[PDB]
RNA sequence: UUCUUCUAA
RNA sequence: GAGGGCGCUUACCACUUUGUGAUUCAUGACUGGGGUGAAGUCGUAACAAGGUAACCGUAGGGGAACCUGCGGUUGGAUCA
RNA sequence: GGCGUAAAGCGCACGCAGGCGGUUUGUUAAGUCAGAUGUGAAAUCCCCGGGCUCAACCUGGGAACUGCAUCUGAUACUGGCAAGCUUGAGUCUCGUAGAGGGGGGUAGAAUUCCAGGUGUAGCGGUGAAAUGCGUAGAGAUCUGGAGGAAUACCGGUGGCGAAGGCGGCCCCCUGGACGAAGACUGACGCUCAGGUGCGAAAGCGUGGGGAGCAAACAGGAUUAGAUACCCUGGUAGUCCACGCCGUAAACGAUGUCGACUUGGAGGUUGUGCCCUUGAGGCGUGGCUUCCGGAGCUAACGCGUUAAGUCGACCGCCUGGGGA
RNA sequence: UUAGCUAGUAGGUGGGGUAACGGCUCACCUAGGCGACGAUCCCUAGCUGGUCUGAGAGGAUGACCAGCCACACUGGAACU
RNA sequence: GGGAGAAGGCACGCUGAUAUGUAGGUGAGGUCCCUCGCGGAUGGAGCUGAAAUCAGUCGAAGAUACCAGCUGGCUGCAACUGUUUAUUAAAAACACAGCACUGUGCAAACACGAAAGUGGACGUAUACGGUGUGACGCCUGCCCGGUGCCGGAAGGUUAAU
């Protein structure tokens, strides 16, 4: 913290990354349904969370949670994702 | 080690006063003759555990006692390392 | 070892207040007297007694008020590793001006409120409060 | 001298 | 007469080609660990002196935690 | 902002560039400060206005544009330049203590082994045993000899070295520290990225040596199992010579060099005075241990050897796993 | 976890060249030049007034307006 | 150290100029010294003579003929130079430096010799003989029951006597 050390080396402010990189700084991105299925969550909760494996515009293959209760989703379907993790 | 009469001669060698003993010229020449007396002790004895505690303590101890007489006085620095045979 | 007599001085003032001593002595300097002749004038010490011939020694008298001390704070602004040179407009106000800031300008040593009225800035030594 | 273990609210 | 034209050739150089490297991305039978489990199997090392005090190095051994040797640390208990 | 234990001070030492600098006098005016010119486009923002019914918006003026250049100063400080001074720093002089270092000897016990005398039936080991060793005479006991390794007591919350560390005695070479009166030197200083050296133990390489001990390994127990803990063995290894490795909870988990700041009880090592009036008293140093005031600390604690108060410079830290 | 880089390179002399100065170009000398104050190499990028946030310090940012720069199917070259 | 002539690419004649012979080599006649010689300096005539540049110029082609390496990538085995089946087999076979074991105290062990004697060796354990392995790097685990070898002398067995 001596200023000579501060002269020889600047304060490296830490660089943070996105947790949602597949959108690549976009609000929403178009996607293609690849597999629609359910998934049991981790220990404190017990459900069958409806979820779909998605091929995106940029070739990314991601999973994205189906909100709500009940849907009409097929594979090979055009959807749109907004973000947000599921805990 | 360097004896009293030998130190007394080196004082009387470079004596500005014959009593001065703050002449680094004397003092350089003292550790000069001291460790030249010790070069037969350390060409003999190599890595002797504390070789730097009583072998290199005089590597550096002669060295930095040169290092103000290094930057001391160009008219006299030129004369002294000539007489002392110093390489640099 | 000895990197500053000034930071030596202010700390000897600082540790003498808490030690409740009446007399803090040290070897004197020309710049030391030029500061010590301000704080008597500014009313933070009582007496300084510069004495010594081979080597001048400044002996101070600490000002105590109602039992406790007067010097509530004593700092160093321009340290020897980092100097401070502020203009006449960037002169500070120690404790909203209630304390004083010792600045040395080309017109010797004075306080900041005098230096504002002198209208010329310089090197800020320390903060006294 | 010897001597172990107790699932998930 | 000079000059110019045209062509000639020269200089430079684009396109393009050869080889050899380098770098980076993708991919790759197989393989290395890593992390994670609301139920498995095996043992029970550490937490108390955790039932052989614990741990650092380093070396060896061993399904697995580990074990053992040398040195150090206490960030260990005990006391007609 | 922090680095004693919550992440974090390199294992230390050396040292260049580097950054940093006692004191005093002049000089210089570089930095610095002040003033003045130039420029810093407009827009924008700010301030004061105006205009659109207001507002948004438009727009007038101002300030500002934190700068840079130039010129004129200023001289306290920081530099630059010279000269000094001696407190810092360093010599000279006498001594002091020490497991400080290498080199070479030399002892004495112990253990092992060998050989012999005496002698007889067990020995050894464990919680019990057993493996094992014994009538081919062990064990035990005495005598003789050989070999390697370590040096009881002293010995000490001792000593020395920067640490890593260093332990019989003697000799040779060699280092560091401290104190005492002095004499001298003239700031000769600090820290130090990169660099350089040292650097426990284990491990590596050639050679050597090998009593004891002992990974691995072997047997015996032990247990449900026992690749362990225990026993009986036993090899590298431990020792030496010369090189490599460069890691340790290399810890005081506190980087180095200054200065200030209540104490008490010690240890060790100097050195004055007082009659040593005995192993005494009054001093004055160096080093180190415990306690503990202020203060600090998340608390715990530290606490003049600071984890108090400040200085200089370096190293480092930035959720956990991954690592 | 980019440390060495450079041969018209670096300087000179002379000639040539351009509106202009200059390896601008050429010849001949010289061996210099650069770099740990980051050369070199790699990745990303038009730049500033400004904009956004922040109490400030700063941080991010360059659509719209400006000032500059660069480009015009691609790669080239001159012409006027 | 190498690999590596890696690979790959460029130049190549002749004529002229530079310089009608240059760089260089050789080196007289001169000149001076000279202890004067089978001299020393100086001195350069002479001869001899590369290499390069520049500019021409000929062919389809200028290292023109003769002469004179095909290179690259992976892997087996042996480290390598070596040695060999004269006369169908040249290697992975052998040898090898290296490693390990073992024997041996000199009148050595051992070998050739009925013997004498000789080699060993005019060497003396850092020596020599034998066997196995075959550089270098990292290494080299377990089992002595068996077979050998070594050590033991209590007892059983037992020759000539």
Domain count for chain B: 1
| Distance to chain A for C119, nearest Cα, Å | 31
Distance between CA atoms of residues B10 and B7, nearest Å: 5
Largest CA distance in chain A: 65
Q: Using DSSP, how many helices (H) and how many strands (E) does chain C show?
A: 3, 9
Name the one residue in this structure whose structure tokens are 């001006």: C97
In three-state secondary structure terms, C85 is strand
Neighbouring subunits of B (3+ Cβ pairs under 8 A): none
Question: What are the chain C neighbours of A3 within 8 Å (beta carbons)?
Answer: 81-82
Is C82's CB within 8 Å of A4's CB?
A: no
> 10 Å Cβ neighbour count for A85?
7
Taking CA atoms, B72 is separated from A37, B21, B80, in Å, by 87, 16, 11
CA C117 to the chain's CA centroid: 20
Distance between CA atoms of residues A56 and A54, nearest Å: 6
Rg, Å, chain C Cα set:
14
Give alpha helix (H) positions in chain C.
6-18, 30-42, 112-118
Q: Which residues pair with A37 in a beta bridge?
A: A51
Interface of C with A (CB under 8 A): 81-82
Rounded distance in angstroms from the CA atom of residue A23 to the C1' atom of nucleotide H64: 71
Closest CA to C84 of C121, C124, C127, C126: C124
- Method for structure elucidation: cryo-EM
β-pairing, A29-39 vs A78-81, is antiparallel
Q: Dihedral of CA C79/C84/C88/C93: which sign?
A: negative
Q: Please name the residues in contact with C30: beta carbons below 8 A apart, sequence gap of 6 or more.
A: none
Domains defined for chain C, CATH in brackets: 1-71 (3.30.1370.30), 72-129 (3.30.1490.10)
Rounded distance in angstroms from the CA atom of residue B33 to the C1' atom of nucleotide F184: 21
Distance between CA atoms of residues C9 and C75, nearest Å: 11
Distance between CA atoms of residues C60 and C8, nearest Å: 14
- Sheet of C45-51: strand order equals C25-27, C57-62, C45-51
CA C6 to the chain's CA centroid: 8
Q: Which stretch of DSSP H or E encloses residue B65?
A: helix B57-70
Subset of residues 15-74 in chain A with CB less than 7 angstroms from any atom in strand E: 42-46
Distance between CA atoms of residues A23 and A85, nearest Å: 13
Domain assignment of residue B84, given as a range: 1-88
Q: Using DSSP, how many helices (H) and how many strands (E) does chain B show?
A: 5, 0
Question: What are the chain A neighbours of C82 within 8 Å (beta carbons)?
Answer: 3
Neighbouring C-alpha atoms within 13 Å toward the C-beta of A31: 25
| CB-based burial label for B78 (10 Å; 0-12, 13-18, 19+) | exposed
Strand F, nucleotides < 7 Å from a protein CB: these are 1-3, 13-16, 19-25, 31-35, 73-78, 85-94, 100-103, 161-165, 173-176, 183-190, 197-199, 242-243, 257-262, 294-295, 308-319
């Amino acid at each position: 913290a001596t200023v000579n050390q501060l002269v020889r080396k600047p304060r490296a402010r830490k660089v943070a990354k996105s947790n949602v990189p597949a959108l690549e700084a976009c609000p929403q991105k178009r996607g293609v349904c690849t597999r629609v299925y359910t998934t049991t969550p981790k220990k404190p909760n017990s459900a069958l969370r409806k979820v779909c494996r998605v091929r995106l515009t940029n070739g990314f293959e991601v999973t994205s949670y189906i909100g709500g209760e009940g849907h009409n989703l097929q594979e090979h379907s055009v959807i749109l994702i907004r973000g947000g993790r599921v805990k | 080690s360097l004896s009293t009469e030998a130190t007394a001669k080196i004082v009387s060698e470079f004596g500005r006063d014959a009593n001065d003993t703050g002449s680094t010229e004397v003092q350089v020449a003292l550790l000069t003759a001291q460790i030249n007396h010790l070069q037969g002790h350390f060409a003999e004895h190599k890595k002797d555990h504390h070789s730097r505690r009583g072998l290199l303590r005089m590597v550096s101890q002669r060295r930095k006692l040169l290092d103000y007489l290094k930057r001391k006085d160009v008219a006299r620095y030129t004369q002294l390392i000539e007489r002392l045979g110093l390489r640099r | 070892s000895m990197q500053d007599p000034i930071a030596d001085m202010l700390t000897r003032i600082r540790n003498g207040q808490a030690a409740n001593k009446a007399a803090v002595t040290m070897p004197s300097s020309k710049l030391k007297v030029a500061i010590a002749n301000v704080l008597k004038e500014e009313g933070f010490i009582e007496d300084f007694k510069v004495e010594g011939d081979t080597k001048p020694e400044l002996e101070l008298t600490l000002k105590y008020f109602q039992g406790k001390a007067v010097v509530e704070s004593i700092q160093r602004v321009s340290r020897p590793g980092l100097r401070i040179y502020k203009r006449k407009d960037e002169l500070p106000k120690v404790m909203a001006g209630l304390g004083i800031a010792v600045v040395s300008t080309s017109k010797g040593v004075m306080t900041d409120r005098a230096a504002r009225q002198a209208g010329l800035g310089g090197e800020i030594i320390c903060y006294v409060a």
